[PDB]
């Protein structure tokens, strides 16, 4: 018999593919794998297959978001078939986007100890979800990053952030990442962009 598949892990690369991997087990004779997916809150069924971590991918249009779906990996050899434990997933929780792109890093005119960052969302971005972001920043000197988190409502069109509490007349290197609110998979960091605070401390 095949070893029971386990360590099922899924990632939805937004509007590219859902991939589920798993630990296959012992490789005693040819093993054909079938990933059985139930999706759309239990109303639709898909599967993919692969052979000899093993890997299997699903595509639009057989993906809806948000969604609660299940995965079950069947492994078959000469002895016979074996099923994994059923696993249960929320697609929005494993949704990964590409990085945002910062296009402006400059103080608001006259405003001290702060930089305003403006960005565009990744080219593929779910308009229906609220976004969360981390902004990483450091002085040009520093060998170490500081981080701040913030969120934007889906209805919120203002794609700027006021980074405050900075040193006067200092250059900062900045990077931004995002994800849907519900997701545990951050985008990679954007490309880094530099900016500089104005002189002084009193607002003018």
């Amino acid at each position, epitope marked *: 018999l095949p070893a029971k598949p386990e360590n099922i892990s899924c990632v939805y690369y937004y509007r590219k593919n859902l991939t589920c991997t798993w630990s296959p087990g012992k490789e005693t004779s040819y093993t054909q794998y079938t990933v059985k997916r139930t999706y759309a809150f239990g109303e639709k069924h898909d599967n993919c297959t692969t052979n000899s971590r093993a890997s299997c991918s699903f*595509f639009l249009p057989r993906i809806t*978001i948000p969604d609660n779906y299940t995965i079950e990996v069947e492994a078959e050899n000469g002895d016979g078939v074996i099923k994994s434990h059923m696993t249960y997933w929320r697609l929005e929780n494993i949704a990964k986007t590409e990085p945002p792109k910062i296009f402006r890093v400059k103080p608001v005119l006259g405003i001290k100890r702060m930089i305003q960052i403006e960005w565009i969302k990744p*080219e593929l971005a779910p308009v229906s979800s609220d976004l969360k972001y981390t902004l990483r920043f450091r002085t040009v000197n520093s060998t170490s990053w500081m981080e701040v988190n913030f969120a934007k409502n889906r209805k919120d069109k203002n794609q700027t952030y006021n980074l405050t509490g900075l040193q006067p007349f200092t250059e900062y290197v900045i990077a931004l990442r995002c994800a849907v609110k519900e997701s545990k998979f951050w985008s990679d960091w954007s490309q880094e962009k530099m900016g500089m605070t104005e002189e002084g401390t009193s607002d003018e």
Partner: antibody, heavy 121, light 109 residues
Framework: QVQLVQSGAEVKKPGASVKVSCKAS????????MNWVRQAPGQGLEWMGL????????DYNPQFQDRVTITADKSTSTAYMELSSLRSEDTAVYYC??????????????WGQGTLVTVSS | GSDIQMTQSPSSLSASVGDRVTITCQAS??????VAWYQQKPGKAPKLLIY???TEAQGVPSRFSGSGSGTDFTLTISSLQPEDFATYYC?????????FGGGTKVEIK
């Protein structure tokens, strides 16, 4: 903004083939399923097939599965529908339509303006 | 591998501005709430009004609403306006092949 601009009208003899194009702009082309649908004059809507431009995967209505080929060219953001072995009953307006609702796959949210293909002597 | 047939009724109807109108769509099998409704004005491409049986698409006036699940679906226009005289199609969006109802033409009395 999202736009699908199709190629111009075509007139074809019975037994010829026709290739219609659908140029997409205002979004990431590979991120969205592109469907093709036709409507004969004074008749209803008929689904022909779709393509996923991400990997070239296609899915055809079996009533036309043989005669229809849908392709997509990432480099130009253009989808194509070819219908082979034209007959007079294939006279129709041919539409491309993007499937765009994250919570509503298999629906047709943005349409091209359509292409009249007339099949006649 | 679906084999779902959609029929609509009435096939056409005549009504007046301000009327409430309801159109029906019937599927040959249980398709949950995977039904969409389109409006097609003379000369134009179809426009999506409703999907998942009752979610309004973007830029759809609130006088349009859909309901139903299983085999029986309705589209209701609460107060018919001039722009609304058009042909309405239902479609299942369960799985391929996608099929459409034959349409309901809403005409001016």
């Amino acid at each position: 903004q999202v736009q699908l601009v199709q190629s111009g009208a075509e007139v074809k003899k019975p037994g010829a083939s026709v290739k219609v194009s659908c140029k997409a702009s205002g979004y990431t082309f590979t991120g969205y399923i592109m469907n093709w649908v036709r409507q004969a004059p004074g008749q209803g809507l008929e689904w022909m097939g779709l393509i996923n431009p991400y990997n070239g995967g296609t899915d055809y209505n079996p009533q036309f599965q043989d005669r229809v080929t849908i392709t997509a060219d990432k480099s130009t953001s253009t989808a194509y529908m070819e219908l082979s072995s034209l007959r007079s009953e294939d006279t129709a307006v041919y539409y491309c339509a993007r499937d765009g609702y994250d919570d509503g796959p298999y629906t047709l949210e943005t349409w091209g303006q359509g292409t009249l293909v007339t099949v006649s002597s | 591998g679906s084999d779902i047939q959609m029929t609509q009724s009435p096939s056409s109807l005549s009504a007046s501005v301000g009327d409430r109108v309801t159109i029906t769509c019937q599927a040959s099998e249980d398709i949950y709430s995977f039904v969409a409704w389109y409006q097609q004005k003379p000369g134009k491409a179809p426009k999506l009004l409703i999907y998942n049986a009752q979610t309004e698409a973007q830029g759809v006036p609130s006088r349009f609403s859909g309901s139903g699940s299983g085999t029986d679906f309705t589209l209701t226009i609460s107060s018919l306006q001039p722009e609304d005289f058009a042909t309405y199609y239902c479609q299942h969006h369960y799985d391929s092949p996608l099929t459409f109802g034959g349409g309901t033409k809403v005409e001016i009395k």
